Each structure stands twice: as structure tokens, then as C-alpha cells.
Amino acid sequence: ADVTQTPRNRITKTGKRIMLECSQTKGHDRMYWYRQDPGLGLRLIYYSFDVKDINKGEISDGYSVSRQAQAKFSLSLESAIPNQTALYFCATSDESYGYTFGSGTRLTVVEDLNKVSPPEVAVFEPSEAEISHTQKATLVCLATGFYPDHVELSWWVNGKEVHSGVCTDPQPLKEQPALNDSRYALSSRLRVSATFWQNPRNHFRCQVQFYGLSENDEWTQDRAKPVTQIVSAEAWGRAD
Amino acid sequence: AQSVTQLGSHVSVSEGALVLLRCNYSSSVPPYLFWYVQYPNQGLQLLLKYTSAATLVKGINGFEAEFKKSETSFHLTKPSAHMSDAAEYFCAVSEQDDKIIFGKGTRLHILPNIQNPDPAVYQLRDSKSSDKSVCLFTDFDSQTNVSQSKDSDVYITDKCVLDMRSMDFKSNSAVAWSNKSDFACANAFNNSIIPEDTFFPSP
Amino acid sequence: GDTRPRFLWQLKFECHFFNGTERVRLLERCIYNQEESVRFDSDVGEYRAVTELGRPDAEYWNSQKDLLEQRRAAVDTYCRHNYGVGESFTVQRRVEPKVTVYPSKTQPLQHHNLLVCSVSGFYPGSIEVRWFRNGQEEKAGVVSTGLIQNGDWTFQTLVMLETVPRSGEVYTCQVEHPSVTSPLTVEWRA
Amino acid sequence: EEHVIIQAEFYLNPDQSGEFMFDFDGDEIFHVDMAKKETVWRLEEFGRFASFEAQGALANIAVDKANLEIMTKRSNYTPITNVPPEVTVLTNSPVELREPNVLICFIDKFTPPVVNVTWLRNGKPVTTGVSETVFLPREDHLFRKFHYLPFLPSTEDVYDCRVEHWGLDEPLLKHWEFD
């Protein structure tokens, strides 16, 4: 936990200046900002070798940085545009090429905050045919109708988060692929033994953490303001 | 630095088989070379680092990489692929200039060893409504893949591997759904080549 | 008027080359207020404290195995590398001397004179300058200001000869230098 | 034959001055101008054959600054003892009437690396065309410096290099005239 980034998740509208903060506890002179994009690796935006020292990297256009203190390195999107949607990583380096990367900041830039929309979530129950055929039981979670593509889906069994027996799609799909501001849908599966599913005390919840508007953002529509929020759906075991 | 080149944005390996991820570099000076891994929903972790101390570099978990100057290569290997090796892997270089330049990344996909395939399409009902459902194609082996639908109102996911640790059991599945009224699980994967013995339970 | 105390830190990385790159030695030196405190010597292969104030650093650095292994590889990846980079214009720098000769005293024949051979502007430093009287060498009465470094990648030196010029004597300053195929020669006639 | 390449750096408090240079057999190859972040070749031709990424020197100097603070604290804020320079005035080539040459003021065997150098012609200060080197290393860890004044020689001009440094008790005045 030497390297801390804030915020961890941010939605912003286009055309706004946005600031991302990095702080370190190791006293390293070298700091870096990278961004990560599918199929391009990490590309270096800016780097700093000392207080007030600033150097452009590979893709510095549309960004600025400040290094007023040794412990902190700030990155600003000068005027955010959609293709600056990315995962942003700060890093420090010691004197012998030992890098420590921060945990990352997931930043989504959208043209129109009016399109932001939380998921609806539904849980679909194992079929009796699967149970009979395999003695296993697959639940399916579907999260639909959300925008932008900025969610985390998890499963909770008897109030404990589980990773075993889960597979979530690695990317949501577009509900209207011809539209550049299509809403998204994402599925996940949780498979358990039939005996476990057949105990009616057992409780299964699909949770979707959605990142959306904050209190600062203005909201003008009749429907509920689409703030960052968790939407869940649940099912209980079934003895049949 | 100058450049690193990784081959293949997505590559597969069979569970249990040798892992080999290729990286070639370009540098005017004797380089620092790196391999990083990014496990799902995490950040970047160093696997191993070439410092010219030795051509055979050893890392965590059996990872190793050999620096070969004559072919300017630094390929990552691991003796046996586990499901937990599924991740994205980045090679990187520094021309001794206190900056790392990253390759484009390769995502390693592990094909589970499925000894007893039992391909089937099941219908799952919404736990809140008797009138909503999805279709689950599951338990097929590595020779089947799922195609996208040809019907703009039918949604089909990529195949996804889950690992049930309670039973030490891995399986493939894909989900399909639609709001359409002509949609039935018997037709949901008609655009995919599915095994001739896929189980279609009587509705 | 500034009376404040000063505090100075110096670092030297020294690459010592013998028979080209055949034998190389790397010396890293940490120096506080003109006194060296810690050093790495590639012939030892670890850091050693030179004073007591340096012991914490030697201990801290030597406890990092991979760090020492890189420092030891640096005889190749730093020293031999940089040597190669500069060889064209440092090891191989050759710059011809300008050489003139002239009597220090204007005077008649048969009197005691100091003839001067200035040789300037040359690189590298290695140079042999000899005085000849009527084709015969003279190692007596030759006195030289020695080799001086101008700090601009050139050298100069003056070589004087005390003689009594006689009627037919031709005097020659001969100078051998890497920059030149065969010796350079310049004459003064009595 | 033998050769020596030295990477030499320093950082000085409270002046906050730092330098980064490479030396080959006692001659300077380059130094880094930290304000411009540029490699400064001692001869022009060097930059045509080689390069150095100047930015890297700033990282080393940042760590030097940090080490100096650590060692300063470790020594219980013990300061450096001043060592005063010695000063020679000479020319790079023999001096001839109405033949442009350059006067060298060579300052040697001093520390800390802070010096004030003045050129005086006929007793008045002159700066036309002056240049200087960075602080150059010595094996005893003292410093050398070269200052330069281009000039055309005459029997009518008299010259002085005035050097001020904290280890002196009065400025050093070194003299030169055509002779």
C-alpha cells in the first residue's frame, strides 16, 4: 500500500478538466503516469524525476501533470474527450528499476450524462433438467440496460462473497450495437451442487456495483438520478 | 527504451501443458527487460526482471525467461498451465533510461481438461417471474465454440469457464436471451456448430 | 558576506580500461565533505565502508543480492558499453601539432642562444620531441616546459635548446606523434 | 594503453547547486545542463557521433540531493572544510602580436565548488566573449575549473584574473602581459 490513487472510479462528461491523484509513502524520486487500453499495453503519459520536474511521455497530448511535492504526482485531463476512457496507473521507481504500480483508476468519459443509466438485475434459477442430468445447478445473473460500461458484478451466498463456481463475461455486450451510446448487458453464472441448491435456507444474491453520477452532477430527468449505487437480485434454494 | 513486440493478442494453452509467451525487443544498449502479469480485476505484478546478471531469469511460480541476445528474444515460460494462470502478460524494456516501455500485451486463455463432456441447452426461469427466462448452453468441450447471433433481438455471450472448487469440476457455458416471442432454447444457438449429441430437455 | 556552512556530496563512477576493453575495473565512490565513505570495487564485488559513517550503506546495499549482481554486470553493460560508444572520438582522437622553431635571442653567429620549438594543439598527449644539429641528435642542453593540458582536448609544450650557432649550421626540431605517419621536422638556418 | 572514464556528480547545500559530467582521461566529454535538460558536448563533433538522454541526470541528482541530506544529518550537520584554490594564467598557444588567442584562467585544488572569477583588462572588468567550464573532478576530490577570455595581443594591454573563494582570506589576483 505504498502507492495510493484517488479516485478509484470516476465518470466524467466530455469537455471538463479532471484531476487524478497519486501519493506514495516510499520517498521515491521517480514517478510515472501510464494509461492502459486493450491491445495497446500501457503507454507512458508523463514522468517526473524530481520535485517540479516534468517530462512528456509517448502520449502526453491532452494531459498535464504537476509534481509540487515528492510524495504526490497529479495528472489532469485538460478537456476530457471519450477516447481518454481508460485505466490509469501511477507508478514509482526506486534506484534500481524496481517499480511499484498503484491499483489503478478506472475513468470513463461520456459525451452526454443524460444517457447514464443503472442496471436492472435479474437472477434466473437452475433448471430441473440440469439438476436431474448432472446433479449440479447453474444460476445465471443478467444485468441489463446500463450505461456507461462501468460495473463490477459479484455473487454473495448466505451473505458471503464467493468466487468459486463463478464465471462473468469479461466484457458487457451492446444492446443496440449500431448506436455509439448503446446501453450494455452483462451475464454471469454461479454453479453449485444440486444438494446445495436444494436446501431452501440457502440464499443467493447477484450484486452489481454501478458507477454513475455523483451528488455534484445535475439531474434534470423525471427518472431517478442514476448515481453510483448497487443493484442486486436474489433467489433462495428450492427443494422441489 | 526503444521497442518490444509481443506476438498474439489472445493465445490459448491446454490445462497442464507448457506455457510459452513470446517477446522480442529492439535496443541500442544492453537492456533491462521485464515481464508483468495483470490478473483479473487487479493491477500489475512483476514476474521477472533481466538485469544482465544472468541469461536465465527465474520468477515466482515456476515462471522463467531466457535472455537470447542473438535473436533479441526474452520469451516467458512456465512448465504447466493452471486455470489460475489466466491473465494478461506484458513484456517491457528499458534502454537503461529510467523509463519502462511496455509491449501490447497477450491474454492467456487456459482450455480446461474436460474428461466427460455433457453438452446441453437448458432453460432457466427468472426467480421473480414465471414468464421470463434465459437459455444456458453448457458442458461442451474445447472443440465447440459459440457464434454470435444473426438476429439483432437475440443476445449470445462468449463462452466462459467456471471452476467449481466444491467438486473440483470445470465447465464451459454461454448464455442466450431475447425479448422476442418466437424465441425458444431449441433455436437459440442455431448459428453455432453444436455437438450432435447436445441434450435438449423436453420443455 | 555569505558565512553559512556548506555541505557537499560527490559521486564518482570510474571505469578503468587496460589493453582496450580486455581488462576493466569499476569503482563507485560516495564522498561526503571531500571524504570518501563507501565504495564499490568490481575487483572485490561488494560495497565496503571506507569510513565509519559509510558502514550503514555498505550493509544496506550488500544485503540486496540482485542489486550487487547488477553492479557486477555493469563492467559490461556500463563500462565496456560507454567505451565502445566513445572510441571513435576519444581513444581514436588524433590531432596534428602545430610546430614552430625560432631563436629566443636575435644575435650574431658564434654566440650563446636559446632556440625554441613550440609544439601546440595536439592530441593525444604522447609525443616525442628531439633536437638535431646538422643531422645529429643532441640530448644535452635540451630543456622542456613539460606537457600541459589546455582543458579543450589539446596539449602544448615548449622544448628549448641551448647552443652556439655557427656559420653553416642547420638546426632541426623533430617531433613524433600518433597523428603523423613519419616525424615532423622544422628547420632554422644560422 | 590505459584509459579512464568517470561519471562525476555533485550536490551542494545551501547553494542548491548540482552538476553531472563525464570525463575521459582528464578531458570533459559532456555535461548536462539541468535547466534546459540538454546534453552539452565539450566539442561540437561529439554530438554528431553519440547521444545522452539528459533527463536521466535529473534522476541521479534528485537522489544525490536526498543522500546529502541523509549524510548531513548523519554527521550531525558537520560542514565541509574550505580548501582555497591555486590560480594559473596562461594561453592555449604561443602569443603573437595581432594574432587572436585565448587567455586561460586555471583554478585548481579547491573545495567547495563555488568560485567568483573576474577578468580585468588594464584594471577594468571585461566580459566580451568570455566562457567557462563546469567544475571538473580531481583524484583527491578537489575541483578544477577553466575560464576563458578571447583576445588579440598587444604590448599595450595588461590582464588579471581575480578569483574569490571562501577558503581565501583575500581575492587571488593573477597577472599576465605580453613578454
Binding site: - | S28 | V85 | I70
Partner: peptide, 13 residues
């Protein structure tokens, strides 16, 4: 052809 520096290391703190 590119000169390389060697990195200064941080003292024990």
C-alpha cells in the same frame, strides 16, 4: 550510439 549512466543509490535511512 548512446551513453548510459549508472544510477546513484539511496543511502540507508
Amino acid at each position: 550510439p548512446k551513453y548510459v549512466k549508472q544510477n546513484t543509490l539511496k543511502l540507508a535511512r
